[PDB]
Amino acid sequence: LASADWIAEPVRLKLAVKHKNRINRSGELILTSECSRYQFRNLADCLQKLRDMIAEASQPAKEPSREDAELRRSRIENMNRERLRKKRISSA
């Protein structure tokens, strides 16, 4: 990712943020496709995925909208671990 020059620097940095899950400790971004028995179709899926990632990262207008369906647990358990975290005295 860092060594790829065909993508702009701001984009190359945002990619390393959103997709860090699929990045590798050697710095490698890794895409994978499965579906078809024909690897032409697979390669095409990969390339289309890459195109789309670069597309959404190169758009500053991306608002990263999040659904409340699977994230309700996240927000509530966050808030509720923040009720306990709220104890204030310095330590270490």
């Binding site: 899950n21 671990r81 306990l84 104890k87 310095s90 330590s91």
Partner: protein
């Protein structure tokens, strides 16, 4: 062909003769109660409890505890009676009651609870989360000494570890502050164990932080056997549980066998069985304090595997079993067309010789 009931039939007790002179519960709720009490008794016929796993049912508990504090029944009773007399006496209090305005000083209730019935509640939470099942295998102890653990999230921030609570690995990147009350003739041992998340060995766990020969309440003064290693669950698997155990020991104990190297970033070197470790030192060590937390993978953990353990980072999925389909039939009868798609291998045409 009649058989003979084995033991009592449920309603055989009450008299059918003269129903009008029998007292009934005209309340739905009274009935509900009586029923739930009846559902808790050990009946002689096939029951829900039997099949659905009361989990060993009756179990004689090998108890490795600290002996329960000895307190006078009658004296305590008298004092409490008195306190309640005094509290009921005030007119101010009654005013607070009728007008629906009152508050309880929660911190004090938390203190009293910690002091009194807390150990038992913490115990049954530990039972619930199966601490005892994975550690001592059969054994229950009541946490007589309260254990206060906390993490530093910043300068002003303190994240407590209560029993069963959730904490993020970011918070746990540093060794925590530990507090409990003992005078010093005392010697203690503190232990932090990752109960699950051992990669190779389903029956084994990881030692994160092991400290020993702890004078009094002094945490840092003790010699550290195994240096603190931050929590590292794996991306796929959810919610590993970490255990803080506190043993009260008599003799000073020295173990070169359990001692680990200072950096100790090898996983084969931290592999642990709380059972065995306790078997060893069983005579001197009696487990006393307990506090534990639930922890799931978060961003910071990635840094561990690469930077410390010099590993690739393992990621997991949750895989559900493939759906069950009946044997395929040559002439599926009266079955929708989409039947043929259930046994389909992959969706792609295949032209065999063509």
């Amino acid at each position: 062909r009649r058989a003979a009931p084995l033991g009592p039939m449920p309603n055989e007790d009450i008299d059918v003769s003269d129903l009008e002179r029998l007292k009934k519960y005209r309340s739905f709720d009274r009935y509900r109660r009586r029923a739930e009490q009846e559902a808790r008794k050990p009946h002689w016929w096939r029951t829900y409890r039997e099949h659905f796993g009361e989990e060993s049912g009756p179990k004689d508990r090998v108890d490795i505890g600290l002996p329960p504090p000895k307190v006078s029944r009658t004296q305590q009773l008298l004092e409490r009676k008195q306190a309640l007399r005094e509290l009921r006496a005030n007119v101010e209090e009654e005013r607070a009651a009728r007008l629906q305005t009152a508050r309880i000083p929660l911190e004090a209730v938390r203190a009293e609870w910690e002091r009194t019935c807390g150990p038992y509640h913490k115990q049954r939470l530990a039972e619930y989360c199966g601490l005892y099942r994975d550690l001592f295998h059969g054994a229950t102890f009541v946490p007589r000494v309260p254990l206060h653990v906390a993490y530093a999230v910043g300068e002003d921030d303190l994240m407590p570890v209560y029993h069963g609570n959730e904490v993020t690995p970011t918070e746990a990147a540093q060794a925590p502050e530990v507090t409990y009350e003992a005078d010093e003739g005392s010697l203690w041992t503190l232990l932090l164990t990752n109960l699950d998340g051992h990669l190779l060995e389903p029956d084994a766990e990881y030692v994160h932080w092991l400290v020993t020969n702890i004078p009094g309440n002094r945490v840092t003064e003790g010699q550290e056997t195994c240096p603190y290693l931050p929590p590292f669950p794996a991306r796929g698997s959810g919610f590993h549980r970490f255990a803080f155990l506190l043993f009260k020991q008599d003799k000073r104990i020295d173990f070169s066998g359990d001692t680990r190297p200072s950096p100790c970033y090898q996983l084969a070197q931290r592999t642990f069985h709380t059972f065995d470790f306790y078997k060893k030192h069983q005579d001197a060590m009696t487990p006393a304090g307990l506090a534990f937390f639930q922890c799931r993978w978060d961003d910071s953990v990635t840094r561990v595997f690469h930077q410390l353990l010099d590993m690739r980072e393992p990621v997991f999925e949750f895989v559900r079993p493939p759906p069950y389909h009946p044997k395929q039939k040559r002439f599926p009868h009266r079955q929708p067309l989409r039947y043929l798609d259930r046994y389909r291998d992959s969706h792609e045409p295949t032209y065999g010789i063509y």
